[PDB]
Design a protein around this ligand. Structure first.
Ligand SMILES: [Mg+2]
Ligand SMILES: [Zn+2]
Ligand SMILES: [Zn+2]
Lengths: 723, 43, 1183, 92
């Protein structure tokens, strides 16, 4: 259990696991949805040495993660958060120290503030203070030592993480758990240099050692060093992840420099833990193609293949060997002989660099096998055309339901071999690899860092969009309502301050419960406007009918102050609100001081091409006599209970029954169907259950009986018994 | 803490020795085999 | 023929062999060390032993066979079991056994006198000292006492468990005795039972065939289910089954017995063995004792012995009864976005295809495409990018037809609907907004299956009932549903809200001045005055009731008027004040139905705004209009429903959240007050707990004020501009979510049950002081536990509901029954020991559309007895009410209507949803429980009170009732604050401990004795101290109380079409004929049995109240049932008595692959119709 | 919703009973030889899709709309469920 096959998705996530921490497992504190007690229990607590925004909602609480400053020296028994004592000394006698209270990083000035009301803490409550008195050490321990100390790590990494509901963040401090190597990466305009770690200590990218000076070939490997002599350097080559990530390691350098990094990471940029792609964005709605809670992409978001990735699925295919039929892999596939094969596959294995689509043989094979011998009329054909007969049921691999892709390679194996630890009684264990240059069609989840799950609506083809007065359209939207007004947050400061990016030209570091505030953005929004407005004012224009007009309402609206020419006013709008904007639809303006600002877009794991299973009869399973079968397909779809009810809630007799009838387990009924329609018009057969027919005997197992008793007592029907 | 499993007839537990992984890393991922590292212990 | 009544029950060992027919015994070699299959003993293919060269003789014809070696044209290659039943014979002849004889003391235990050790003998260790022959130590008798050695003091009489099989064909004729003999043991009291249950015991048998063939001599296991073999991929293969290795246990023993006795194994041994079989039998049966883990010793898993699996719950039974599977099913993501809304649906080209693959081929037949369907799929291969004209065809499979659409989870029939189809591009499936709500599941990229009914008689049996444009408008529960939830509101909302930006209040003399002049500065759309007007002038914009007020729209068309409520003078029916910021409204909603004429009335313009009055407009359009428009209309608030919100937008900015510059003042204040408050307790006055309640009760109240503030600065300064506003008034957003946003929000409480000192240091435009985003977390996460508990506890409450109610249908229409039941109209409020007037909703959803009782004289208009009170009418009484001619309006619902056969027409007020009274047939049974299909999530297991009662469980404490009434009696004392009652006849001691201390000087029938002012104690004593009088109520309103503090738009019908159940049962009282002085029989049957039979003798019953679950179990049938706690136990007393189990019982049919007697299948509709005049004029001359 | 749907639900004894009738005079209808419905001229619905047109093979809708021509009755009429095929010759 606990083993939780590592979730090495991104470089981070993984790490968290190495932490997470749970009272679940084999130790007694255990199962889902309570024993005797679990609801009133593992609630919150009295331990700040832990974030309170990481669980989820199901087996909640019983899962989280430790925090940064926590567990050093004696972690061996009971957690111990670091503590500050005014100067160059430190203590952390466990998360038990509840004697003498502590301060909470606020106000200061070279060892001593002046609050006069030390925002300190006793046990749990939060008494006003009582400045212990002497800068001479804390009241036996007092100082957040730093803000972030309160949260794990999977937390202290979100922008104004001091401006949203807890549960918003939560539904975020777990989204990050699911990223995607967009290869392009970016490292957020906003953020906390903790990324100085994130990568490194998780060893995503690489590192170094004392001396310096490169040389290299780049290609795959990397130069060396000078100190302890030369030293080659492997890397990755995409490689397999435990779910798809497919982690690569392109690098950086050229000649000689040793600080101290070395070659990128999967989802990374110059040591700055990059995870997503911070393109522009802007609140507001549009044809509601963002109802409830949706996002709207701009095809240009494909042009520059910004959003895309890769996933590697290992395909395990075998051939044991009974004693009746011996399974092997000659590229001489029977019955079906075509260029469709011999050209690509050939000699079994298929050369690297081959494009593949659904049903495309992956490792063709044979198998002697004679299960259903010679047919009747069929013989009228085996010759009619003269393809004689076959002797080795096609048995092949053929790509699953669907997975058009490439080939990073193959791989062969076999018995008696010294290193081949195959399952006894077998030989061969073909294991070809395929990855897929992903993309972003219409459905994948986007979501940001403060809680806002996307759900692509209808990506737009440039022409449309919000055309900034200077061409630049809004690559991304994200209409309010849903979680903004609702389940509140802050982020936004990740929009405004944002624009002070595509424009102002700088990126920023925004700590937690410290720095980055409502006035900050202003002083920043400053030079920004003068700048932007600058260009145009010295480039061509300054104030236009449209760009101006709006400003009108801007006033009547209850915003702009009736001042100087359109300059001053047009400014303000900036600062917080966003400059004008028009509309690639009609072309009019967007009556209202809209908002805009490059921010952050993630595009989590829950894609689509991976989370979908469509089909028909396909399955057809045995013993169960109910769908779930196919050496090709493999879907399902339960209707189990509820789904039922709601249906009978009306009179879908022929439809309700229809389920449990033909489209379920009428066996004959099954064929009666396909045949029925296949043939043509006709209310496919009435019905005959089965799973029940089962229960009957299944029941009769014991001393029971099931006179499928008929009408007026004496008719007595026991139907099923042969037919 | 594991009494020398009783029945003369008396076993003894003395010292360990490990490391020496029979299958260095990567190899294993090319196939399987945990990067296990065998040991022993004089008895 | 055609199925019907489903018989079952026993099949005496004599029978075993019947089905057993033959085949069995021998060993069970689960294959050979070699050629895997067969073994010539176990799952051996009947008469298949390598090369039997026979058996094929039994078969008449059909095909050849007999191939000597290997195998012939037998089943082994084809038709092997064919999933059919195949009985094994078992060689079993050894001593005795026991088919579990259940866990209720039957098939033994009772039928003698035995138990607590009726297995001290049956499981060999004692003896059922049968045999008459003068004993010694004190006579013999005929029942266990041979404590071993004793049955050796004489050295019949045997420990052997064959004794049950002994007195078998024995106490069988004496069954004509037990019938007689026993019952004759009358009165004395207490002991009155046993014999009671004993009755049935015998009474189940008798002229109901069967025998005590419960003793066993031939277990009978099949073989098919097991012979499953090698499974590869990923990382493991090898393959085997269970029940077999479980089975084995048996035969081996039953085999080793015989050969280990024949060789003379004297005493001791013999039993100790034999019994093995016994134990070995409790194998295939039920592993319920010590266990039989695999891996033996093996400290592990449980042998799948019909326990936890097969027959059990959620393994096979709970699985294949409903947990079935469509076959054209599938799934996909989730979208949205204007289309044609309703009947329209996303669906992706490809993805689709398959679902329709069948016919697809078909059409491709005669009509080009291809020749023989033979190919067909041959062209659908390896994604050979079909496209070409094919697509141009699939829409001939599509076109007109429709499909479904479900959701995970599902707590509303709305849960499906089903839309017609069309198709855009790419994967992921789109859907129309509104429906969104009917799933209360946002767009976190979720998925939704899209099954597809195939049968023509299912499609019509769909769209015309399933089409998203039908059972989604006004839905069950009460109010409507297909309304424009979030967003759309704002989109229009905006186009309204006056705007009065206030500029002044100068003056005028009718336009010359002011009006003219003022247009230079100072003043505008304000108040002004020229004689009696304000400033709606300048622009006249006129017309006539034609096709365009023209100006207006065309006026703003240019850089003129502001579409947003600017205010010009309209002209439509007559001089309109309104602006285009509202006239437009009409026009669209007008263009929907036609001639704005109507719109006019309906709509509200003298207070547009829009929000919670939209439900209405649509909802009112209904009654007066009718679906075929509701769509168009509700489907216009789509197009424009968005464009407005579009070509206007309304962002949000860190700024936008406006701090109330009238804030830092209020705050400061309080604290001060506090300052002393503290520098008070700190001196010497008021215990801590005092000031405690204080400090809190200071912000407990300071808050609301801060709250008040912001919610105005907005509505004066920055009316709509503060988009963070019209998002809470009504459109999409909560109120105490803004004050949280901008205000302060800081009452915040601890973990267990106490409140925090300090509060939240908001100004959420500024950070929090750690502790803040801490204590906040404290409270925050608890929400989380409540949400996952509800969603995970729903697993106990909804299923039971769904169950206890089930057969509830409604054929026929006119069971004209008496005893009406006036719906309460005024409730005693225990805050006001007088009388309020109810929120005017409970009434609504408590009378909304009903079937009046006895005349409704009042306010001049007379409302005839027996009438469907239209919403329009509830008002007629609602508003009316006041006067005082009606305080308890009458009508009939389910609290009466002696027809457990269903629920009959017109007894279920109106029919909630479709404008009309209960349509005919309707299986309300569903909707019934499916009424509580929006609760779950919304509630609180975390105490849960929605059942403490629902299951008649004597609540926690309850604060016991007042047995009867009469004399006050207020006896003061030491520590026993026990007050009582009496009145010259009798009574008792009512002790009210150190709890409630509220007196009273009168009487009252059962009130409450005053301790539990809320929820009477266990009705388990109320009914007793009253009757179904006030026990079919209390709860009924005592329930809602758990919904009336969490929105809830339901009541009336629903929750009251459930109760009936819970009490229906009865406990017979001294009758004649149908016996069972104790009994528990069903309701309505009693009537019939106290009717048809009436024409004699008595049957005097006695109202009886159970719980709900207990209600669900043991019902008119045997078929359904099960599905619960005591799986075996019900099947127990199931067999025995022939139990034919009626039929009418949907859940029944379903399972049994029989049509569901309801909706469009029940008795009421077998109807015909076809006839084209000359066709009907064909048999009109051909007959 | 359904074309004229409002003229249905009521013009019967109750919902289902309607839907019911419908899906019968459908197979029976088109499925028993396309040329069978009561409609005469062009009042017979069509499908002017791509370039070409044709009667919607979705029979089901004819009946709906067929219940708008005074023709056709519904109820316990002519007990010979078989004889419903008595026409199964007069229409071949
Ligand atoms: Mg979710
Ligand atoms: Zn043979
Ligand atoms: Zn009735």
């Amino acid at each position: 259990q606990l083993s939780q096959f590592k979730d090495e998705t991104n470089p981070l996530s993984s790490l968290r696991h190495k932490r997470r921490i749970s009272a679940l497992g084999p130790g007694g504190l255990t199962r889902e949805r309570a024993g005797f007690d679990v609801r009133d229990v593992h609630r919150t607590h009295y331990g700040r040495i832990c974030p309170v925004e990481t669980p989820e909602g199901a087996n909640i609480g019983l899962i989280t993660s430790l925090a940064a400053y926590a567990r050093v020296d004696a972690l061996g028994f009971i957690r111990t958060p670091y503590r500050r004592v005014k100067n160059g000394v430190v203590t952390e006698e466990v998360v038990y120290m509840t004697a003498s209270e502590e301060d909470r990083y606020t106000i200061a000035q070279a060892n001593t503030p002046l609050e006069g009301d030390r925002i300190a803490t006793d046990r749990v409550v939060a008494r006003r203070r009582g400045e212990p008195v002497i800068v001479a050490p804390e009241e036996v321990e007092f100082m957040d030592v730093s803000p972030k100390q309160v949260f794990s790590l999977n937390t202290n990494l979100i922008p104004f993480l001091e401006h949203d509901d807890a549960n918003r963040a939560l539904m975020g401090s777990n989204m990050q758990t699911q990223a995607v190597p967009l290869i392009r990466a970016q490292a957020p305009v906003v953020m906390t240099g903790l990324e100085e770690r994130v990568v490194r200590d998780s060893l995503a990218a690489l590192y170094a050692e004392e001396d310096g000076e490169v040389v290299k070939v780049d290609g795959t490997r990397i130069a060396v060093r000078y100190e302890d002599g030369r030293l080659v350097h492997p890397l990755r080559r995409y490689a397999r992840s435990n779910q798809g990530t497919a982690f690569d390691q392109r690098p950086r350098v050229r000649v000689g420099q040793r600080v101290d990094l070395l070659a990128d990471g999967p989802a990374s940029e110059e040591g700055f833990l990059a995870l997503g792609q911070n393109v522009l964005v802007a609140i507001m709605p549009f044809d509601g193609y963002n109802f409830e809670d949706a996002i709207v992409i701009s095809e240009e978001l494909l042009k520059r293949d910004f959003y895309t990735s890769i996933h590697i699925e290992r395909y395990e295919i075998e051939a044991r060997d009974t004693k009746l039929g011996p399974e092997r892999i000659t590229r001489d596939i029977p019955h079906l002989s075509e260029a469709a094969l011999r050209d690509l596959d050939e000699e079994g294995i298929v050369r690297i660099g081959a494009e593949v689509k659904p049903g495309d043989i992956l490792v063709g094979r044979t198998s002697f096998k004679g299960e259903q011998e010679p047919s009747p009329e069929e013989r009228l054909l085996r010759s009619i055309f003269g393809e004689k007969a076959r002797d080795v049921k096609d048995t092949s691999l053929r790509v699953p339901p669907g997975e058009g892709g490439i080939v990073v390679g193959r791989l062969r194996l076999r018995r008696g071999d010294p290193g081949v630890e195959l399952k006894p009684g077998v030989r061969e264990v073909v294991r070809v690899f395929v990855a897929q240059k992903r993309k972003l069609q219409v459905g994948d989840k986007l979501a940001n860092r403060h809680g806002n799950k996307g759900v692509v609506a209808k990506i737009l083809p440039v022409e449309d969009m919000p055309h900034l007065p200077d061409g630049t359209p809004v690559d991304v939207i994200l209409n309010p309502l849903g979680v903004p007004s609702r389940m509140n947050l802050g982020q936004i400061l990740e929009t405004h301050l944002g624009l002070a990016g595509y424009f102002l030209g700088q990126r920023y570091i925004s700590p937690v419960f410290d720095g980055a505030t409502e006035p900050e953005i202003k002083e920043l929004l400053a030079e920004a406007f003068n700048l932007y407005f600058g260009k145009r004012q010295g480039e061509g224009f300054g104030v236009d009918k449209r760009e101006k007009e709006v400003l009108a309402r801007a006033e009547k609206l209850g915003l702009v102050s009736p001042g100087k020419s359109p300059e001053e006013q047009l400014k303000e709008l900036f600062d917080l609100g966003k400059v004008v904007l028009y509309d690639g639809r009609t072309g009019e303006p967007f009556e209202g001081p809209i908002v805009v600002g490059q921010m952050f877009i993630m595009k989590l794991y829950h894609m689509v091409e991976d989370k979908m299973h469509a089909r028909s009869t396909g399955p057809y399973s045995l013993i169960t006599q109910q769908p779930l079968g196919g050496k090709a397909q493999f879907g399902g779809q339960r209707f189990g209970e509820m789904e039922v009810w709601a249906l009978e809630a009306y009179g879908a007799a022929h439809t309700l029954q229809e389920m449990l009838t033909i489209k379920s387990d009428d066996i004959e009924g099954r064929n009666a169907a396909y045949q029925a329609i296949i043939k043509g018009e006709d209310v496919p057969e009435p019905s005959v259950p089965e799973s029940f027919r089962v229960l009957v005997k299944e029941l009769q197992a014991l001393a029971l009986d099931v006179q499928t008793l008929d009408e007026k007592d004496n008719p007595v029907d026991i139907f099923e018994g042969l037919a | 803490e594991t009494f020398p499993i009783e029945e003369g007839l008396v076993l003894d537990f003395l010292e360990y020795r490990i490391g020496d992984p029979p299958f260095s890393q990567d190899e294993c991922r090319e196939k399987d085999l945990t990067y296990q590292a065998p040991l022993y212990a004089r008895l | 023929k055609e199925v019907r009544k489903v018989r079952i029950a026993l099949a005496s060992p004599e029978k075993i062999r019947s089905w057993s027919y033959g085949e069995v015994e021998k060993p069970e070699t689960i294959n050979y060390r070699t050629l895997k299959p067969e073994r010539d003993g176990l799952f051996d293919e009947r008469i298949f032993g390598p090369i039997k060269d026979y058996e094929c003789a039994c078969g008449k014809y059909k095909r050849q066979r007999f191939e000597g070696k290997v195998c012939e044209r037998c089943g082994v290659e084809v038709t092997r079991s064919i999933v059919r039943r195949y009985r094994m014979g078992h060689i079993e002849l050894a001593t005795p056994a026991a088919h579990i004889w259940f866990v209720k003391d039957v098939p033994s235990k009772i039928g003698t006198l035995l138990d607590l050790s009726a297995t001290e003998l049956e499981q060999v260790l004692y003896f059922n000292k049968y045999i008459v022959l003068d004993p010694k130590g004190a006579v013999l008798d005929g029942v266990p006492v041979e404590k071993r050695q004793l049955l050796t003091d004489e050295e019949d009489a045997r420990m052997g468990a064959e004794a049950i099989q002994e007195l078998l064909k024995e106490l069988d004729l004496e069954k004509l005795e037990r019938e007689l003999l026993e019952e004759m043991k009358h009165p004395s009291r207490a002991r009155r039972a046993k014999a009671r249950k004993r009755l049935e015991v015998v009474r189940a048998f008798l002229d109901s065939g069967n025998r005590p063939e419960w003793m066993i001599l031939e277990a009978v296991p099949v073989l098919p289910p097991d012979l499953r073999p090698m499974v590869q991929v990923d990382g493991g293969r090898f393959a085997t089954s269970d029940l077999n290795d479980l089975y084995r246990r048996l035969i081996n023993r039953n085999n080793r017995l015989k050969k280990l006795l024949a060789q003379g194994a004297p005493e001791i041994i013999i039993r100790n063995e034999k019994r093995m079989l016994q134990e070995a039998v409790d194998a295939v049966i039920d592993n319920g004792r010590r266990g039989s883990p695999v891996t033996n010793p093996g400290s592990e898993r449980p042998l799948r012995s019909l326990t936890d699996i097969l027959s059990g719950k959620q393994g096979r039974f709970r699985q294949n009864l409903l947990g079935k599977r469509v076959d054209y099913s599938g799934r996909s993501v989730i979208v949205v976005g204007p289309q044609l809304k309703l009947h329209q649906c996303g669906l992706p080209k490809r993805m689709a295809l398959e679902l329709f693959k069948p016919f697809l081929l078909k059409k491709m037949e005669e009509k080009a495409f291809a020749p023989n369907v033979k190919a067909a799929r041959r062209m659908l291969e390896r994604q050979r990018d079909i496209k070409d004209e094919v697509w141009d065809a699939l829409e001939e499979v599509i076109h007109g037809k429709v499909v479904l659409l479900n959701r995970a989870p599902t707590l509303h029939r709305l849960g499906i609907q089903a839309f017609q189809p069309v198709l855009v591009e790419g994967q992921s499936i789109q859907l129309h907004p509104l429906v969104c709500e009917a799933f209360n599941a946002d767009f976190d990229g979720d998925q939704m299956a899209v099954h597809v009914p195939l049968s023509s008689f299912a499609q019509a049996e769909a769209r015309i009932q399933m089409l998203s444009a039908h059972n989604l408008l006004s839905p069950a529960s009460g109010e409507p549903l297909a309304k424009p939830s979030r967003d759309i509101i704002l989109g229009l909302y905006y186009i309204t809200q006056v705007r009065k930006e206030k500029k002044g209040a100068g003056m005028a003399f009718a336009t010359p001045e002011e009006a003219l002049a003022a247009y230079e500065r100072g003043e505008v759309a304000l108040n002004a005055p020229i004689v009696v007007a304000g400033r709606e002038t300048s622009v006249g914009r006129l017309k006539f009731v034609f096709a365009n007020p023209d100006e207006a729209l065309l006026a703003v068309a240019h850089g003129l008027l502001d579409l947003q409520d600017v205010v010009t003078v309209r002209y439509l029916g007559r001089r309109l004040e309104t602006s285009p910021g509202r006239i437009l409204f009409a026009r669209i909603v007008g263009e929907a139905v036609g001639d704005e004429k109507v719109a006019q009335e309906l709509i509200q313009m003298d207070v547009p705004q829009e929000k919670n009055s939209l439900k209405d407009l649509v909802y009112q359009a209904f009654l007066r209009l009718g679906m075929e428009k509701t769509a168009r209309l509700l489907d216009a608030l789509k197009y424009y429903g968005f464009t407005l919100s579009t070509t206007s937008g309304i962002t949000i900015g860190i700024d936008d959240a406006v701090i109330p510059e009238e804030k830092q003042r209020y705050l400061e204040e309080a604290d001060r007050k506090l300052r002393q408050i503290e520098q008070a307790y700190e001196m010497g006055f008021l215990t801590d707990r005092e000031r405690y309640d204080q400090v809190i009760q200071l912000w407990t109240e300071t808050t609301e004020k801060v709250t008040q503030a912001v919610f105005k600065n907005f509505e004066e300064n920055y009316p709509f501009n503060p988009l963070y506003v019209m998002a809470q008034s009504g459109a999409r957003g909560n109120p105490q979510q803004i004050r949280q946003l901008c205000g302060m929000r800081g009452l915040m409480q601890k973990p267990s049950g106490e409140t925090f000192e300090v509060p939240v240091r908001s100004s959420f435009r500024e950070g929090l002081t750690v502790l803040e985003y801490f204590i906040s977390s404290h409270g925050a996460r608890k929400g989380g536990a409540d949400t996952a508990l509800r969603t995970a506890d729903s697993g106990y409450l909804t299923r039971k509901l769904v169950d206890v109610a089930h057969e509830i249908v409604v054929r026929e229409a006119d069971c004209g029954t008496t005893n009406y039941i006036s719906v309460p109209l005024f409730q005693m409020d225990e805050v006001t020991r007088t009388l309020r007037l109810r929120k005017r909703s409970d009434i609504e959803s408590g009378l909304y559309g009903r079937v009046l009782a006895r005349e409704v004289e009042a306010l001049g208009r007379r409302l005839e007895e027996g009438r469907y009170l239209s919403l329009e009418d509830v008002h007629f009484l609602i508003k009316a009410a006041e006067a005082g001619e009606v305080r308890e309006v009458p009508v009939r619902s389910p609290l009466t209507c002696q027809t457990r056969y269903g629920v009959c027409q017109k007894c279920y007020g109106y029919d909630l949803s479709m404008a009309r009274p209960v349509s005919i047939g309707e299986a309300v049974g569903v909707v019934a429980a499916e009424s509580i299909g929006e609760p779950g999530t919304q509630l609180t297991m975390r105490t849960p009170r929605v059942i403490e009662l629902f299951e008649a469980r004597r609540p926690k404490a309850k604060a016991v009732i007042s047995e009867i009434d009469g004399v006050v009696r207020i006896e003061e004392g030491e520590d026993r604050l026990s007050v009582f009652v009496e009145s010259e006849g009798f009574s008792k001691e009512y002790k009210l401990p150190k709890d409630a201390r509220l007196l009273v000087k009168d009487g009252d029938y059962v009130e409450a004795g005053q301790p539990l002012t809320r929820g009477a104690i266990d009705p388990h004593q109320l009914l007793e101290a009253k009757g179904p009088e006030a026990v079919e109520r209390y709860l009924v309103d005592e329930i809602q109380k758990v919904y009336r503090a969490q929105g809830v738009k339901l009541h009336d019908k629903h929750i009251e079409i459930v109760v009936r159940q819970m009490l229906k049962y009865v406990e017979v009282t001294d009758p004649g004929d149908s016996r069972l002085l104790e009994g528990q029989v069903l309701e309505k049957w009693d009537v019939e049995a106290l009717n048809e039979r009436l024409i004699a003798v008595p049957v005097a019953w006695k109202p009886l109240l159970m719980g709900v679950t207990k209600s669900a179990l043991s019902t008119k049938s045997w078929l359904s049932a099960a599905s619960f706690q005591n799986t075996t136990h019900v099947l127990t007393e199931a067999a025995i008595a022939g139990k034919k189990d009626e039929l009418i019982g949907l859940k029944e049919n379903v399972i049994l692959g029989r049509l569901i007697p309801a909706g469009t299948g029940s008795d009421f509709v077998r109807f015909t119709q076809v006839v084209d005049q000359r066709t009907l004029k064909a048999i009109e001359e051909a007959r | 919703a359904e074309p004229g749907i409002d003229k249905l639900f009521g013009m019967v004894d109750s919902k289902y009973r309607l839907t019911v009738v419908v899906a019968k005079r459908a197979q029976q209808l088109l499925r028993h030889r396309f040329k069978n419905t009561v409609l005469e001229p062009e009042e017979r619905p069509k499908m002017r899709t791509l370039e070409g047109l044709y009667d919607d093979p979705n029979a089901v809708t004819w009946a709906m709309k067929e219940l708008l021509t005074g023709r056709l009755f519904f109820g316990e009429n002519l007990v010979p469920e078989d004889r419903l095929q008595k026409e199964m010759e007069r229409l071949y």
